Amino acid sequence: TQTQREVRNAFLFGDKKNSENLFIERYYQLLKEGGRLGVVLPESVFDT
Amino acid sequence: IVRAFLIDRLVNELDYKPEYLETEKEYTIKGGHSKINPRVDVLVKDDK
Description:
The structure is cut from a larger assembly and holds two copies of chain A (48 residues). Chain A has 48 residues and is mainly α. Chain A contains two helices and no strands. Chain A binds chain B through residues 5-6, 8-9, and chain B through 17, 19, 47-48.
């Protein structure tokens, strides 16, 4: 609860309780223009 | 000194989380006259 409330201002989809997806937003926040991203995301990102 | 005491009392006596707190926030919209772009002394917020 407290952690979710403390982080739902720095992410667009912080309200949604899918905190696993927050990492992709953090990946965008970290990568510079033209950077490369490689992840091991599960299938739920792709199909659900 | 008074600013530091206010910060201490707000974080501890007023039971407000230190993350929800800002000290200096410049405003070039000329919100009054403190500096060339007047700023704040203490600001605390909720989850927004």
